[PDB]
Amino acid sequence: PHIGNYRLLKTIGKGNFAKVKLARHILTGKEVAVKIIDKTQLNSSSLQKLFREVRIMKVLNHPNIVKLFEVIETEKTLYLVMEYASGGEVFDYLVAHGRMKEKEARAKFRQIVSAVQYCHQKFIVHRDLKAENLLLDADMNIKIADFGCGSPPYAAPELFQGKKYDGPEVDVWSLGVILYTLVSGSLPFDGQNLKELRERVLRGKYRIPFYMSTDCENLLKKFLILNPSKRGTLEQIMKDRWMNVGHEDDELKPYVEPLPDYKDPRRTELMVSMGYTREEIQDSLVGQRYNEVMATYLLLGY
C-alpha cells in the first residue's frame, strides 16, 4: 500500500507480470495510475520493448496521450507512475453505448489524429493502435495508452504480404480502422478464421453503414489505402472536410508542443517548503529525470 510518495488504492488491472494499481500522490493528493512490472519474469525481448516504452513516455507531452510522472527503479521491479484515465477503455464504451454520432466521433478522432501525428512528428510509431489501446478521461477526452486480443483487425495489409512493416503509414491504416469503429461500432474487416481476416484486409473493401455520411466515408478512403506509399500523410488528412465540421474556425494543425516552464514560482515555493532545493528542482526538470522531485512538480500543475 506504500511505494514512494504514493498510496496504492484499487487495482485497475493485472496481467503479463505487470499490475496497474490506482494510487494517490501523498504530498499533492493528486490521483495517479501506477504500472508495477516485475522485471525478473520478463523474457529477454519483453525488456528491450519495456525500456523502449520508458524512453518514449519520457518524451511525449500531449493532452491526449497518458503523461508519465515518475519512474521508480529497483533491480527486481519497475514502477511507472502515469496519468489516470477514469473513463476506462474506448472499446468498453463502444460496446456499452453502441456507435458514436459523427459529431461525437469527430471530437474524439481529432484528439486521436493530433496525438498520433505528434508521435510521428518525433519519429515514434505506435504500430499497434486498437480500441482497447485508447482510454477516456473524466471529461471524455482521449488518453492514448502504452507502447510496449483484438490486435489483428487493425493490422495493415503489408502484414499479410511480408513487406517491411516499419513505417508510420502503418498507423494511418490503423487510424482508419479506429475511425470506422468509432462511427459504426463494428470492425470494417472481419472473419471467423485469420485466412478470412487476411482475404478481406488484402481486398481492401469494407461494409459502409447506411447512416454514414459521404464526408466520413471519404476520410476512410484517405486512410484505408492498400499501397502504403499511396497512403496520405497524417498532416494532409488533418485538412479533411469531415475532420473540420464545426471547426471552420480552428483547422486541425500538427500539435505544437508547449515550451518548458521549469521555473514556476508557485510550484517552486511549495516544493522549497517541502524541503526540496530550487537547485535540485531545476536540475531534475532540465535533466528530465522523472524522479520524486520531477513527479512532485508535474503533479503540482493541476
Rounded to the nearest whole angstrom, what is the least distance from the CB of residue 298 to ligand 6Z5 in the complex? 15
Rounded to the nearest whole angstrom, what is the least distance from the CB of residue 22 to ligand 6Z5 in the complex? 8
3-state secondary structure of 54: helix
Q: Is 15 known to sit in a ligand binding site? A: yes
Q: Is 43 known to sit in a ligand binding site? A: no
Cell triple for 159: 502484414
- Residue whose CB is less far from ligand 6Z5, 13 or 260: 13
Residue 156 in contact with residue 226, Cβ under 8 Å? no
Residue 125 in contact with residue 243, Cβ under 8 Å? no
Q: Considering only residues 36, 56, 82, 243, which one is a binding residue for ligand 6Z5 as defined by CB under 6 A?
A: 82
129 forms part of the interface with ligand 6Z5 (CB under 6 A): no
Binding-site size for ligand 6Z5 (CB under 6 A) equals: 15
Distance CA 173, CA 154 (A): 8
Q: In what order do the strands lie in the sheet with 68-73?
A: 6-8, 18-25, 31-38, 77-82, 68-73
98 forms part of the interface with ligand 6Z5 (CB under 6 A): no
- Residue whose CB is less far from ligand 6Z5, 12 or 274: 12
145 forms part of the interface with ligand 6Z5 (CB under 6 A): yes
- Residue whose CB is less far from ligand 6Z5, 153 or 228: 153
Rg of the chain on CA atoms, in Å: 21
Q: Is 16 known to sit in a ligand binding site? A: yes
Q: Considering only residues 23, 50, 78, 89, which one is a binding residue for ligand 6Z5 as defined by CB under 6 A?
A: 89
The window from 85-93, 157-165, 171-179, 255-263 that contacts ligand 6Z5 (CB under 6 A) reads 85-93
Residues labelled catalytic? 128
- What is 159-201 written as a DSSP string? GTT-----STHHHHHHHHHHHHHHHHSS-SS--SSHHHHHHHH
Residue 221: burial class (beta carbons within 10 Å; 0-12, 13-18, 19+): exposed
37 forms part of the interface with ligand 6Z5 (CB under 6 A): no
88 forms part of the interface with ligand 6Z5 (CB under 6 A): yes
Q: Is 20 known to sit in a ligand binding site? A: yes
The window from 79-87, 229-237, 268-276, 279-287 that contacts ligand 6Z5 (CB under 6 A) reads 79-87
Distance CA 83, CA 92 (A): 19
- Residue whose CB is less far from ligand 6Z5, 131 or 155: 131
Residue 166 makes CB contacts below 8 A (sequence gap 6+) with 125
Residue 142 in contact with residue 135, Cβ under 8 Å? yes
Rounded to the nearest whole angstrom, what is the least distance from the CB of residue 118 to ligand 6Z5 in the complex? 17
Q: Considering only residues 20, 156, 238, 252, which one is a binding residue for ligand 6Z5 as defined by CB under 6 A?
A: 20
**SS3 sequence, 261-292?**
CCCCHHHHHHHHHCCCCHHHHHHHHHCCCCCH
- Residue whose CB is less far from ligand 6Z5, 51 or 165: 51
Which residues are near ligand 6Z5 by CB under 6 A?
Answer: 12-13, 20, 33, 35, 66, 82, 84-85, 88-89, 132, 135, 145-146
| Residues placed in the known binding site for ATP | 12-20, 35
